[PDB]
Amino acid sequence: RIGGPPVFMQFPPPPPKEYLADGTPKTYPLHQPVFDHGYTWEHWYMTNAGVFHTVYYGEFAK
Amino acid sequence: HQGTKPPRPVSLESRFMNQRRYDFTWMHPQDKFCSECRPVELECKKMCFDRYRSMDYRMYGFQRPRIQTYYSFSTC
């Protein structure tokens, strides 16, 4: 139907990036903390990635 | 036929007849008119309205003779 809701639209470009006065890129809130402690273990698990593939999923102590 | 329905014998209150746990107030939760009368017990309400009128509280209905009103279907 002409004029109906398009079945596909391209994303518009993202808004301009922001830099501080000194030139440092501006950071935004990020809820991925780097916990402080002495543990450094890394556990890996072969995970189902569909029916024919897997992925080696790693969990890091930090 | 309904306008001149013959009177029927007064029901004898049998073993399981006329059982009440609480007064009839679901029609008037706050006003509680005719708490003792049943929702469509006209004769009970008439005498109850008369008490309220005798207490200086107006109530509508049951005052005009049936044969002196229109649409009664009770005229000779």
Partner: protein
């Protein structure tokens, strides 16, 4: 008649096809939110009082 000039059908939700009228109707009900809260809160107070729940401490004093 031009098919491309009716895009408001899918660009705007049907509940607001009416422009300011639909928005005004939505806005009017929004004004009643706090009046409703006070009204609802009063009912809780009414039941709480009628059940003598305010006299919990005075009952045993």
């Amino acid at each position: 008649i031009d098919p491309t000039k009716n895009q408001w059908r899918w660009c705007v939700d049907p509940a607001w096809y009416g422009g300011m009228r639909d928005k005004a109707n939505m806005d009017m009900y929004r004004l009643m939110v706090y009046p409703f809260f006070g009204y609802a809160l009063l009912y809780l107070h009414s039941r709480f009082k009628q059940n003598d729940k305010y006299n919990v401490f005075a009952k045993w004093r």
